[PDB]
């Protein structure tokens, strides 16, 4: 009663509920925290002015992104070259920027739907939540991180992912949490029962498998985890050791593992320079009957006589003879902001000094690329950050795909919660597309994810070892793979258009 | 990823 109508307490209480949402992700795996966090956001924005609701939404977002993506400081501080106070400011700015979309969501929600009714929390908010979440994941190439849909990878709503996708799970979570907040505030059991029923409906969907496994095509897949130090990785002198470490770890695996995978950019030197190594290595693999899929950095000429530096996945060995001018390669398309390219580079150039802005930039590969071929196996590649973009992976996905391929380098963030959150989003792609995921990392979570988003084999982080295990390919198309996000956007359009049309009266 | 060399 007292000091709860006040915004100060209501603003401070939004940080706690925002920060409570970070407990729903991989390092902690508490999916009830996602419901409680969203329930707090819905309830705290009740009976507030549109500007006051935006402040609550911003502070809720600042709590979520002030503790959910605070691991970015580790990458910034370890190798940033910037003063300590400067590093702290950048992480705060990232949390503040991503909190604008949450602040925008709450500000718009209270403006058009001021009264606290079932329309606002069940029809209006989930439709508006996806629009604001889309903008967060689209503006300036986006950053679709800390989405509550990924928290249900092992939860009871995992069955809805292969049908509509991850963006529908957090759409449903907003419905359930909004109804729970409506029930709690107004002391009404009707929003509580409807929230329970809507949450319990997708439970039997998790026992439906859209894939038929293929026992006759079982292979042994070995993924080498180099554990190359990030600081010494891109150096002249560590190149010879890095090649020897991977080559000596891979040599015993030839002739026994049909598919061998190296982490992202395992070969640091340019592909045009490391030709004798790749040609000789391809000969060894083909003779013994194995294929290698390794990440590398390639600089290609073009029509205008320039160089386009790509983050490439080259394939060698049986079933894919190596050639510089070949088609069995994957160039990374969605570059990491400020890590591989500088957004607004024409505007941020004056501020590039005293900001550690990278002078060079990778070239973006085509949005749609053919699946990789290696020993008669189709792989849908997705380099590191691209494994969190469910729509892009689905577009590159094909019916002939056997496994989903992902190579990453999470050594920047060290011992933090970031690699796990990245790993959790990778598991959702396997669940959505019903294909096994072959994830290899320099020192991160190198694991084989099953067709239902289940960890089959995994190795501890920060170690130099190989993950040799048998994986069975799956065939069959999920409803998500057939349709995509458009069935959800129609639901968002139907909910959004109806909510606005109700607000127009 | 990190470019440079
Ligand atoms: C390889 O495959 C990696 C990519 S590299 C990952 C690593 C690299 O780290 C470094 O190289 C160390 C230096 C990092 C760059 C610092 C540059 C700072 C420049 C100024 C920034 C502020 C500009 C505006 C004010 C003047 O780590 C990183 O890349 C760290 C990235 C840090 C980003 C800092 C953002 C600062 C706040 C910006 C707020 C918005 C401003 C809008 C203005 C209109 N990748 C992988 O292997 C996979 C990694 C997955 C996790 C990726 C984690 C980082 C995500 C960054 C998202 C930024 C979104 C920006 C808005 C769309």
Author numbering:
A (entry chain A): 4 to 508
B (entry chain B): 2 to 6
What's the paper's own text on this?
Lnt is a 57-kDa protein that is present in diderm bacteria. It converts a diacylated BLP (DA-BLP) to a triacylated BLP (TA-BLP) using glycerophospholipids (GPLs) as acyl donors. The reaction is proposed to proceed by a ping-pong mechanism at catalytic triad residues Glu267, Lys335, and Cys387 (Escherichia coli numbering). Lnt is composed of two equally sized domains, a membrane domain (MD) and a nitrilase-like domain (ND).
The P2 state has Lnt in complex with the final product, TA-BLP. Because map quality is better for P2A, it will be used to describe the P2 state. The overall architecture of the protein in the P2A complex closely resembles that observed with representatives of earlier reaction states. However, the bound TA-BLPtide sets the P2 state apart. Accordingly, the acyl amide linkage in TA-BLPtide is positioned within a few angstroms of the catalytic site represented, in this instance, by Cys387Ala. The diacylated glyceryl moiety extends away from the catalytic center toward the front of the enzyme. Its acyl chains run parallel to one another and parallel to the N-acyl chain, which sits along the bottom of the hydrophobic groove at the base of the pocket. The peptide part of the product is fully extended, and the density for the peptide is continuous up to the backbone of the third lysine. The peptide passes through the opening at the top of the binding pocket created by changes in the conformation of arm 3 and arm 7 relative to those adopted in the M1 and P1 states where the much smaller PE or lyso-PE molecules are bound. In size and location, the opening in the pocket is similar to the one observed in the M2 mimic, supporting our denoting this structure as an M2 mimetic.
